Amino acid sequence: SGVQCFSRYPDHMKQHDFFKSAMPEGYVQERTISFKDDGNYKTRAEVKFEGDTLVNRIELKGIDFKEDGNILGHKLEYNYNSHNVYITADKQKNGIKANFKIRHNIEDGSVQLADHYQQNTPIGDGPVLLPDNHYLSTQSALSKDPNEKRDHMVLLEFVTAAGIT
Amino acid sequence: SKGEELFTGVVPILVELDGDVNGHKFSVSGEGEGDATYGKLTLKFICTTGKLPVPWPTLVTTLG
Ligand SMILES: [Mg+2]
C-alpha cells in the first residue's frame, strides 16, 4: 500500500494515474489507520526516486492500543485478504484522497477491521494527474524466508486499477 | 504522464520505516522491486531493532 505507483493502470485509464505522474519528484502519502475497538496508526511517507531507485520513507505513530487487544497481543494471523482502495481527487491540494477497509483475520476466526483514510500530495512542481473516481484492486501474499532468522516479512502483491470503462 | 515512462521496466525499491506504537519504538528496512506493467511488487522487510512489537500484517499497507 506504500508504493501505489506500481499499480497497473490499464491503458484506457492512464490519465487517472496520479501516483506515477508525481514522479520523479514524488509525493507525500499520509494515512490514519483506525483499528476497530483499538488504537490507531498515523503515518507520513515520502515516496520519490533517488536515482533509478524508488524509495518509500515512512514515520509511523500508534497510540491508544489495548495491551491485550489483537495488535499488541499479537492475535492476528499471518495472512492477508484482497481489498479495493477507493480513490478520489483532492483538487484543493492538487492530489488525491483514498478510503478503504482492511480485514485482518484474528486467530479465533474473527476479523479485526482497520479503516484506512489516505491523502497524497505532490512534492514537485511538474503537472500531476487528478483522477476521476476509481479503485485499485489489490491482492497480497505474505510468506517467510526459510533461511531468515531475523523478524521479517516477504510480500508479493498485485495491484490493478479499475472502475472506469 | 512523463512520470510513467519511469515505470516501463523493473524498478528497484527501498523502504525505510521508523515507528513508535504505544511507546514501543522500532524500525523496518525493506528491499525489492516493482514491475508496474504487471502491477507486481516483491518486497522483503526486516525489523532492524529486534522483534516487531505489532503484527506484520498490520504494516502491509504502510510498507508494501
Ligand atoms: Mg473526467
UniProtKB/Swiss-Prot annotation, chain B:
Residues of the full protein shown: 2 to 65 of 238
Biological function: Energy-transfer acceptor. Its role is to transduce the blue chemiluminescence of the protein aequorin into green fluorescent light by energy transfer. Fluoresces in vivo upon receiving energy from the Ca(2+)-activated photoprotein aequorin.
UniProt effect for mutating residue 45 to L: In mut3.3; shifts fluorescence lifetime from 3.03 to 1.88 ns. In R10-3; matures to the red-emitting state with excitation and emission maxima at 555 and 585 nm, respectively
Known uses: Green fluorescent protein has been engineered to produce a vast number of variously colored mutants, fusion proteins, and biosensors. Further generation of mutants led to more stable proteins (at 37 degrees Celsius for example) with brighter fluorescence and longer fluorescence lifetimes.
Organism of derivation: Aequorea victoria (Water jellyfish)
Summary of subunit composition and partner proteins: Monomer.
Tissue: Photocytes.
Post-translational modification summary for this protein: Contains a chromophore consisting of modified amino acid residues. Maturation of the chromophore requires nothing other than molecular oxygen.
UniProt protein name: Green fluorescent protein
Family the UniProt entry places it in: Belongs to the GFP family.
